[PDB]
Structure 1
Amino acid sequence: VKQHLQRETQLKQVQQRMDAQRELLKKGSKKKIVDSSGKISFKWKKQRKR
């Protein structure tokens, strides 16, 4: 059971980061910020997609 659950969380992380990448691809007006501990993130300009 233990390795079930840990593999589960690992795959959750993989899927989350990979959907972050997809979103990166899709559309909009992105912005790349290096958050204080040194970690990248993306913020979209306030914009209603038509």
Structure 2
Amino acid sequence: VKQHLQRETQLKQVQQRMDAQRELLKKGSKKKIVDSSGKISFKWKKQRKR
């Protein structure tokens, strides 16, 4: 049971990173912010998509 839980957690984190990379593909005005801990995040411009 513990192994099941660990495997499912690892798969959830993998899918979260994959969905972030999928979001970086569509449209909009992304801004590549770096958190000063050193980790990359993205922030979109405030503009209503149609």
Q: Same fold (TM over 0.5)?
A: yes
Deviation at 1:6, TM superposition (A): 0.4
Superposition TM-score, scaled by structure 1 size: 0.96
- Residues 1-50 of structure 1 show CA distances to partners (whole Å, capped at 9, x for unaligned) of 00100000000000000000000011110000110110000000000001
RMSD value, Cα: 0.5
> Unaligned stretches of 5+ in structure 2?
none
Higher strand share: 2
Would you tell me which structure has more helix in proportion to its own residues? 1
Number of positions where the alignment pairs a residue of Structure 1 with one of Structure 2: 50
Overall identity of the aligned pairs, in % = 100
